[PDB]
C-alpha cells in the first residue's frame, strides 16, 4: 500500500500545481490582450496615438531547399537549425537576430505568431530533444526530466515559457527539436521565391504568417 | 483585393529631434505589411528619412464612407516609364475609392504594360461638379437618360440540342 | 513506451493527460453586453476623413 501511495499523492499535488500554474498563465494572456485593447481604445478616444510593441518572439520557416545556396547563407541555416525545407524554429527577435535574418531573407519567411500557433505546434508537432534524440512530448514527465532545473513541469509551462519569452527561452531550445512541417495545404503563392511584399512568399510577413502555419502544420 | 490604409509615421525620438513631426499619408496596399513597406519607401524617397531611424505610430484601414453612392474619382499618378519620368491623370466612376484604384491599376497594366512597382499614386480626389469632369467617356455617362443594349451578352452540358437564342 | 503518437488536438483523452486544466477552461466569456461604449475620438474622425 505504501511507497506507491506517497508517489501517487506527490504525483497528485504536482497535477494541481500545473493546473494552478496554467490558470495563472491563461489569466496573464487574457489580461495582456485586454490591456492591448483598452490602451488602444483610450488612445484613439482622447486623441494621442498608441504605438505597437516591439516583439521579442518570431517564428521562422525555411522555404528553399538545400541546393544552390551561397556558403554565407547555408552557414546561417546551420546556426538557425534550419537544415531542411519547410522546417521551422523560434528565434528571440533582437538586433543580432534581426540583422542576421536579412542575410537569408529570400530563403526564409518570418513573422510574429500569437498564442494559438505556439500551442498547436507543441501539442501536435512538438518533438522534444531528449538525450540527443527526437522524443515526442506525449507526457508531462518528459518535459519535467529535461526542464525541472528551470521549474518547467508541463507542456503548458513550456508554452508560456516560449510564447511570453521567459529567461529560459535559450534553456528550452535544445530541449525542443525543429518543427518539421508539411507542405502547406492550398499551396504557396503563385511565385514563391519573391519577397512577401512583392507578391512572393519569402521574407518578413507579420500578421500573415499565422495563416501560413495553419496550412503548413 | 486592395484596401486603403492611412499610415502615420515618424523618426525615432532623440536629442536632435525630441518630438519629431508625425507624417501621415493614405496609400493603397493589399495588406498591412505592404502598406508599411510602401510608406517607408515613400518617406525615404520624398523627405529622406531612413527606415532604421523611423517607426510606425498608427496604421488604420479606411472603409468607404458611402459605398453605395455612385461617385467619380480623378487620379493623378507619376508613372515610371522607359525614361522613368511620366505624369498621368485618369478619370473613373464607381462606388468605392479602392475600386477606382484597382480599376486604375488594371488600366495601367493594359494600356501601358505597367507594374505595381512603377506606379506612384499622387492623389485620389472625389469630383462632384459635373462640369468639372474632363474625360469624354465619363461625361457622356453622366447624361440623365442613359440607356443602352446589354453590351457583350455572350449568353458543363456539352452538345446543347437547340441553337442558342443569344438575343432577347 | 509510446508506440504511437496521438494529437491532443484530436484525441480528447490525451488533453486530459497533458492538461489537468481543460476540464474547466470556459473559452467564451461575456465581456461585452447591450451596453457597448462606442469610442472614437472626434479629431480622430477629422484626421481619418482628411485629404
Amino acid at each position: 500500500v505504501a511507497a506507491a501511495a506517497e508517489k501517487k499523492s506527490a504525483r497528485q499535488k504536482k497535477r494541481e500545481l500545473i493546473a494552478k500554474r496554467a490558470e495563472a498563465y491563461e489569466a496573464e494572456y487574457r489580461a495582456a490582450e485586454r490591456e492591448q485593447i483598452e490602451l488602444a481604445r483610450k488612445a484613439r478616444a482622447e486623441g494621442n496615438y498608441f504605438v505597437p510593441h516591439e516583439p521579442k518572439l518570431i517564428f521562422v520557416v525555411r522555404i528553399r531547399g538545400i541546393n544552390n545556396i551561397p556558403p554565407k547563407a547555408r552557414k546561417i541555416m546551420q546556426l538557425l537549425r534550419l537544415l531542411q525545407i519547410n522546417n521551422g524554429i523560434f528565434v528571440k527577435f533582437n538586433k543580432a537576430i534581426k540583422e542576421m535574418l536579412q542575410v537569408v531573407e529570400p530563403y526564409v519567411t518570418y513573422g510574429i505568431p500569437n498564442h494559438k500557433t505556439v500551442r498547436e505546434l507543441i501539442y501536435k508537432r512538438g518533438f522534444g530533444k531528449v538525450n540527443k534524440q527526437r522524443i515526442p512530448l506525449s507526457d508531462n514527465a518528459i518535459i519535467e526530466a529535461a526542464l525541472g532545473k528551470y521549474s518547467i513541469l508541463s507542456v503548458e509551462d513550456l508554452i508560456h515559457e516560449i510564447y511570453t519569452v521567459g529567461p529560459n527561452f535559450k534553456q528550452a531550445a535544445n530541449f525542443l527539436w525543429p518543427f518539421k512541417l508539411s507542405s502547406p495545404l492550398g499551396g504557396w503563392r503563385e511565385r514563391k521565391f519573391k519577397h512577401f511584399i512583392e507578391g512572393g512568399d519569402a521574407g518578413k510577413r507579420d500578421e500573415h504568417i499565422n495563416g501560413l502555419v495553419q496550412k503548413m502544420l | 483585393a486592395l484596401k486603403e490604409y492611412q499610415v502615420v509615421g515618424r523618426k525615432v525620438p532623440t536629442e536632435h529631434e525630441p518630438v519629431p513631426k508625425l507624417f501621415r499619408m493614405r496609400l493603397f496596399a493589399p495588406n498591412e505589411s505592404v502598406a508599411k513597406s510602401r510608406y517607408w519607401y515613400f518617406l525615404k524617397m520624398i523627405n529622406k528619412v531612413k527606415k532604421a531611424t523611423g517607426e510606425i505610430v498608427a496604421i488604420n484601414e479606411i472603409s468607404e464612407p458611402k459605398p453605395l453612392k455612385a461617385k467619380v474619382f480623378g487620379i493623378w499618378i507619376r508613372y515610371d516609364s522607359r525614361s522613368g519620368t511620366h505624369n498621368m491623370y485618369k478619370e473613373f466612376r464607381d462606388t468605392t475609392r479602392v475600386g477606382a484604384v484597382e480599376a486604375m491599376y488594371a488600366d495601367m497594366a493594359a494600356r501601358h504594360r505597367a507594374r505595381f512597382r512603377s506606379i506612384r499614386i499622387l492623389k485620389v480626389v472625389e469630383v462632384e461638379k459635373k462640369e468639372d469632369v474632363r474625360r469624354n467617356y465619363v461625361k457622356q455617362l453622366l447624361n440623365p437618360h442613359l440607356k443602352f443594349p446589354l453590351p457583350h451578352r455572350r449568353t458543363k452540358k456539352v452538345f446543347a440540342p437547340h441553337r442558342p437564342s443569344t438575343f432577347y | 513506451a509510446h508506440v504511437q503518437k496521438k494529437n491532443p488536438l484530436k484525441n480528447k483523452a490525451v488533453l486530459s493527460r497533458l492538461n489537468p486544466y481543460a476540464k474547466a477552461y470556459k473559452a467564451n466569456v461575456k465581456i461585452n453586453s447591450e451596453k457597448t461604449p462606442k469610442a472614437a475620438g472626434e479629431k480622430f474622425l477629422s484626421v481619418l476623413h482628411e485629404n
Partner: peptide, 16 residues
Amino acid sequence: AHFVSTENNEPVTLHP
C-alpha cells in the same frame, strides 16, 4: 509600448 504625441504636432499629409 508607449505613447506617441499627436496634439503638439498634428499629422501632416504627404504625397509623392
